[PDB]
Amino acid sequence: MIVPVRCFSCGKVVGDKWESYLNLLQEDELDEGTALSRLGLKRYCCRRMILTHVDLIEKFLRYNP
Amino acid sequence: ATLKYICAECSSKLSLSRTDAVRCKDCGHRILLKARTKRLVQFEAR
Amino acid sequence: EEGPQVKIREASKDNVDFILSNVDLAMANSLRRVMIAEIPTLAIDSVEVETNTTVLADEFIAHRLGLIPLQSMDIEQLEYSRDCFCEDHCDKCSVVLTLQAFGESESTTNVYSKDLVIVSNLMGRNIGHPIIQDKEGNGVLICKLRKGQELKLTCVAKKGIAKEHAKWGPAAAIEFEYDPWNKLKHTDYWYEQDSAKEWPQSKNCEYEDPPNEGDPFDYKAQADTFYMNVESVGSIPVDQVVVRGIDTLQKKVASILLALTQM
Amino acid sequence: MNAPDRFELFLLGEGESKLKIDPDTKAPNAVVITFEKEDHTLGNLIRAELLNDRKVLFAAYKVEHPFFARFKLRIQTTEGYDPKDALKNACNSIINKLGALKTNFETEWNLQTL
Amino acid sequence: MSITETFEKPQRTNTLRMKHGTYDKLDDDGLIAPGVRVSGEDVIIGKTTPISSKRDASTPLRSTENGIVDQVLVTTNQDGLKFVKVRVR
Ligand SMILES: [Zn+2]
Ligand SMILES: [Zn+2]
Ligand SMILES: [Zn+2]
């Protein structure tokens, strides 16, 4: 639904890097790999967390009630 | 101020007894939702 | 100071790259495990929900709440609710926080950990303050609200340990290596044509001397010199994760000598 | 439903003690200690140190089943040397060992910039 | 003729026909309300039938299930039938 709070494997806090990641892409026109490394996500367990998330909440919010 | 039921669409807090069929005010939505409880639920944070 | 010897390489508010030397592999490991599972911490462990018209389920939200790292600097000056002599939770053993949010604007309203508010009395001990490390002081994104939706919760932080639930863990990961030059021959490298050419040489190969071509296998060498790196999650200063790691391990053995004693 | 509470991993239930010392029969000067609510963290530790003692003839541990938090420690020592003592010794020897490590670290911490 | 069924809390009279699950959780409209935590063989829908005073017709929660009421919906069919759908989460 939303950014998991932490990396399932190691515990790293990741729920505080979703918007930043989104910006690193749009307003800075960076690539996902370079973007992810700049957010500090160095090990692939943490990288996959963000790179693979699907923000379905942004579609739930579109229903009226 | 209490509310026994809600309406599937206009969200307007309805609430009637028997012989009142099932309709809202202007929103004839014969649906209606049962409204939450006041008896606050506790949750394990695990 | 004769015995285990630390030799720090890097250090920051998050990591502590260091080199343990002159110690048993067993101790490097037990310490390695303790940091991951038995260092006390404060974390939301109970959520009362007054109102949730959000798009998520209560237990769903509650689950995230518990994952939100909280200030656990003076965690020792706080007791485990199970030991405390009150009835349930009190200022002597718990920190109460609140979350009230309303979708006011028409634009999507975000809810962060910063929006959490302590309601109990911290009696002067740095504890329960939601950790924040992002470049905008927002914290973790707990939920999202559409205009009209609401979220009224009441949490209750409590002292805990990873063994009970990974939310209470102060550690994020723990690099650990030894004998970067496979001299003790603890592992047998898998290869297609060349062991050496196919396996990436590690960082720590620089901090050591490559064995010499004709030297016969050193059969009496043991395992000392362990290259670690601790990453803190914020609920506690990195340096602390380590230090208290050694501390808890210390208290553990102590609880045993005291067992033979009163035995 | 069948899952036991997680606190049962580190909290001694009722009627249980941190240690149950039993005399080994198969051999002389041998004891078998049962540590309740402890795992490999202490097991492999006390084992390793116990092995640095020369008047110690045997030391091994094992958690018979991952479901339960408890391990068994068997120690065999030279005649005259009580196994119970080797344990006390191994413990203290460990506790000291850590105290030093603790210091050296807090020392090296300060000398760092950041 | 002159014989229906009612969604309301039952309290034994002449027939006593009911079941082990407790009705304490129902509301007087005969339905539990969102937020109420359910389990065991608890009753989700209280119903009754006078067959020629009260014969318990009612829906207990599945024996190997237990969650929290997520939504109760009350409606009508094409034949003007009172409908009830209880979703448990
Ligand atoms: Zn990770
Ligand atoms: Zn309506
Ligand atoms: Zn208390």
Provide the β-strand partners of residue E75. E83
C90 marked among binding-site residues: yes
Specify whether the CB–CB gap between A4 and C140 falls below 8 A.
no
3-state class of C140 per DSSP? Answer: coil
Specify whether the CB–CB gap between A12 and C233 falls below 8 A.
yes
Q: Which residues of A touch B9 (CB under 8 A)?
A: 64-65
Provide the β-strand partners of residue C100. C152
Question: Cβ B37–E74 below 8 Å, yes or no?
Answer: no
Specify whether the CB–CB gap between C127 and C73 falls below 8 A.
yes
Question: Cβ A16–C134 below 8 Å, yes or no?
Answer: yes
Q: Are C154 and C177 within one domain?
A: no
CATH number of B1-46: 2.20.28.30
As a whole number of angstroms, the distance between CA A41 and CA A23 comes to 16
Question: Six-digit token pair at E73?
Answer: 């919906």
E35 CB-near residues (< 8 Å, 6+ apart): B36, B37, B39, B40, B41, E68, E69
Domain boundaries, chain E: 1-89
Q: CA of C49, closest CA in chain B: separation in Å?
A: 6
D3 CB-near residues (< 8 Å, 6+ apart): none
DSSP annotation of E63 reads T
As a whole number of angstroms, the distance between CA B35 and CA E34 comes to 7
Q: State the CB neighbour count (10 A cutoff) for residue D107.
A: 13
CA D105 remoteness from chain centre: 24
Q: What is the resolution of this structure in A?
A: 2.8
As a whole number of angstroms, the distance between CA D94 and CA D46 comes to 8
Q: Which of C115, C149, C166 is the last residue of a domain?
A: C166
CA angle D108, D110, D114 (to 5 degrees): 110
Question: Cβ C141–A6 below 8 Å, yes or no?
Answer: no
Neighbour subunits, C (≥3 Cβ pairs < 8 A): A, B, D, E
Question: Cβ E34–B5 below 8 Å, yes or no?
Answer: no
Q: Which of C119, C148, C166 is the last residue of a domain?
A: C166
- Shortest-distance ligand to the CA of residue A40: 1
The CATH number of whichever domain residue C60 belongs to comes to 2.170.120.12
Q: Is A65 on the interface with B (CB under 8 A)?
A: yes
Q: What is the dihedral of CA C233, A15, B43, B3, to 10 degrees?
A: 150
SS (H, E, C) C153-198: EEEEEEEECCCCCHHHCCEEEEEEEECCCCCCCCCCCCCCCCHHHH
CATH number of E1-89: 2.40.50.150
Q: Which residues of B touch A64 (CB under 8 A)?
A: 9
Q: CA of C225, closest CA in chain A: separation in Å?
A: 24
Q: Identity (one letter) of the amino acid at A16? A: D
DSSP annotation of D33 reads E
E strand spans, chain A = none
- Tell me which residue has tokens 């034949």: E79
Write down the architecture of domain D1-114 according to CATH.
2-Layer Sandwich (3.30)
As a whole number of angstroms, the distance between CA C179 and CA C226 comes to 8
E87 CB-near residues (< 8 Å, 6+ apart): E69, E70, E71, E72, E73
As a whole number of angstroms, the distance between CA E61 and CA C230 comes to 49
D94 CB-near residues (< 8 Å, 6+ apart): C27, C253, D45, D46, D49
Closest C-alpha to D40, from D20, D18, D63, D74: D63
Q: Are C172 and C246 within one domain?
A: yes
Query: C217-225 long-range contacts, Cβ below 8 Å, gap at least 24?
Result: C217/C185, C218/C183, C221/C183, C221/C184, C222/C25, C222/C184, C223/C24, C223/C25, C223/C178, C223/C179, C223/C184, C223/C186, C224/C21, C224/C22, C224/C23, C225/C19, C225/C20, C225/C21, C225/C178, C225/C179
Measured between CB atoms, which of C55, C141, C171 is closest to A60? C55
Question: Cβ A57–C55 below 8 Å, yes or no?
Answer: yes
Q: Which of C150, C166, C182 is the last residue of a domain?
A: C166
As a whole number of angstroms, the distance between CA C131 and CA C9 comes to 26
Q: Which residues line ion ligand 2, judged by CB < 5 Å?
A: B 7, 10, 24, 27, 29
DSSP annotation of C38 reads -
Residue-wise over C60-74: b if at least 16 C-beta within 10 A, else e? bbbbbbbbbbbbbee
As a whole number of angstroms, the distance between CA D60 and CA E81 comes to 74
Chain pair C-E, CB pairs under 8 angstroms? 4
Q: State the CB neighbour count (10 A cutoff) for residue C261.
A: 8
Q: Is C98 on the interface with B (CB under 8 A)?
A: no
Question: Cβ C67–A6 below 8 Å, yes or no?
Answer: yes
Q: Is A29 on the interface with B (CB under 8 A)?
A: no
Specify whether the CB–CB gap between B43 and C47 falls below 8 A.
yes
- Tell me which residue has tokens 């739930």: A60
Neighbour subunits, A (≥3 Cβ pairs < 8 A): B, C
- Name the phi and psi angles at D65, rounded to 5: -150, 120
Q: Which of C47, C65, C140 to mutate to test the interface with A (most CBs of A within 10 A)?
A: C140
Length of chain E counted residue by residue: 89
Q: Is B19 on the interface with E (CB under 8 A)?
A: no
Residue-wise over E21-41: b if at least 16 C-beta within 10 A, else e? bebebbbebbbbbbbbbbeee
Q: Is B24 on the interface with E (CB under 8 A)?
A: no
A53 marked among binding-site residues: no
CA D14 remoteness from chain centre: 21
Provide the β-strand partners of residue D94. none
Q: Which residues of C touch E68 (CB under 8 A)?
A: 58-59
- Shortest-distance ligand to the CA of residue B32: 2
As a whole number of angstroms, the distance between CA C144 and CA A55 comes to 11
Length of chain D counted residue by residue: 114
| Cβ-based interface (< 8 Å): residues of E facing C | 68, 70, 89
CATH number of A1-65: 1.10.10.60
- How was this structure determined? It was done by X-ray
Question: Cβ E75–B31 below 8 Å, yes or no?
Answer: yes
Give the range of the structural domain holding residue C181, as residue numbers without chain letter. Answer: 1-40+167-263
Specify whether the CB–CB gap between C29 and C249 falls below 8 A.
no
As a whole number of angstroms, the distance between CA C139 and CA C154 comes to 18
Domain boundaries, chain B: 1-46
